[PDB]
Amino acid sequence: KPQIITQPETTMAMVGKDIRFTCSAASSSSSPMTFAWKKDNEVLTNADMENFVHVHAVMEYTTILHLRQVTFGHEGRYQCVITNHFGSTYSHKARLTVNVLPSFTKTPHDITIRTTTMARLECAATGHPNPQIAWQKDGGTDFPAARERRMHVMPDDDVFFITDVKIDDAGVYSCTAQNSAGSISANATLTVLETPSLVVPLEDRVVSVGETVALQCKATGNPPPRITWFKGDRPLSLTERHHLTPDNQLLVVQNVVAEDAGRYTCEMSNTLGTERAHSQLSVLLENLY
Numbered sequence: 001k002p003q004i005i006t007q008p009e010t011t012m013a014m015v016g017k018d019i020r021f022t023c024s025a026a027s028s029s030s031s032p033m034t035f036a037w038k039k040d041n042e043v044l045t046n047a048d049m050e051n052f053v054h055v056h057a058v059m060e061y062t063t064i065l066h067l068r069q070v071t072f073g074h075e076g077r078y079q080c081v082i083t084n085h086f087g088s089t090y091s092h093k094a095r096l097t098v099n100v101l102p103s104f105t106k107t108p109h110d111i112t113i114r115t116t117t118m119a120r121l122e123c124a125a126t127g128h129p130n131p132q133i134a135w136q137k138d139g140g141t142d143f144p145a146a147r148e149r150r151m152h153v154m155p156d157d158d159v160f161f162i163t164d165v166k167i168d169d170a171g172v173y174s175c176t177a178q179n180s181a182g183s184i185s186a187n188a189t190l191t192v193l194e195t196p197s198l199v200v201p202l203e204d205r206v207v208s209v210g211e212t213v214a215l216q217c218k219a220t221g222n223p224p225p226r227i228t229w230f231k232g233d234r235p236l237s238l239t240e241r242h243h244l245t246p247d248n249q250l251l252v253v254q255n256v257v258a259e260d261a262g263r264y265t266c267e268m269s270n271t272l273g274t275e276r277a278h279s280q281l282s283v284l285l286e287n288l289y
């Protein structure tokens with residue numbers, strides 16, 4: 001009749017680390033006690049046990065089963081058995097399961113993509129139990145591809161993709177793999193560009209000598225396109241009568257003159273390419289001299 005005080009509790013351990021089970025008992029008598037541990041109903045001979053004694057004023061003896069450098073083979077159901085000259089006491093059964101920290105097999109890398117195309121992000125990890133993959137943009141969740149349900153994943157090939165890439169999709173994306181052991185994460189910067197284009201069409205104009213004409217070239221694209229104006233096929237020579245906004249988008253010519261007639265070309269460029277828009281300016285002449 002050795003009466004158990006502390007019973008071994010079910011626990012989890014990471015592979016490679018040490019773990020321990022403890023049960024402690026105290027006999028009604030002073031007859032010596034013997035501790036045993038039986039895994040899956042088969043004892044460990046050559047087992048690593050360590051024994052302690054407590055002096056409560058009762059002599060409580062504690063036994064510790066050391067499991068050094070745990071592997072998957074250590075996985076099982078453990079129990080402590082205490083024997084004296086009276087009888088044997090049996091403890092609760094404690095389960096031991098094992099962890100393996102997640103390790104990346106595929107990480108996303110920095111890419112530069114155009115608008116309206118499809119961006120692909122690879123990300124996979126091993127580990128026990130199998131890790132779940134989570135995503136972040138700039139450290140959060142309020143990002144357009146998620147909010148607009150445009151981000152998806154291939155079913156069995158571990159590939160994430162975004163359809164119809166917006167400008168606001170650009171930023172740092174963080175891939176995070178997590179299980180019951182821990183978390184790891186990898187960054188990838190998505191950079192989104194757009195070829196230059198015209199917002200509103202550039203229309204032909206017809207004005208009379210002395211009137212004022214205005215040509216607007218509202219250009220989009222990323223990076224913001226540099227705008228250059230041309231008359232004929234030479235760069236536009238500016239006068240006191242010519243006006244430009246700093247962005248060069250609005251071109252105004254006051255007091256139009258016969259020499260002003262001709263084709264005005266709007267040239268929009270960035271690192272992706274160049275687009276052009278044309279406007280024919282016709283002038284209604286009353287008298288040349």
Ligand SMILES: *[C@@H]1O[C@H](CO)[C@@H](O)[C@H](O)[C@H]1NC(C)=O
Binds near residue numbers: 138139172174186187
């Ligand atoms: C991942 O990105 C976050 C936020 O951009 C940053 O704080 C962290 O240092 C990055 N980690 C690495 C390894 O670059």
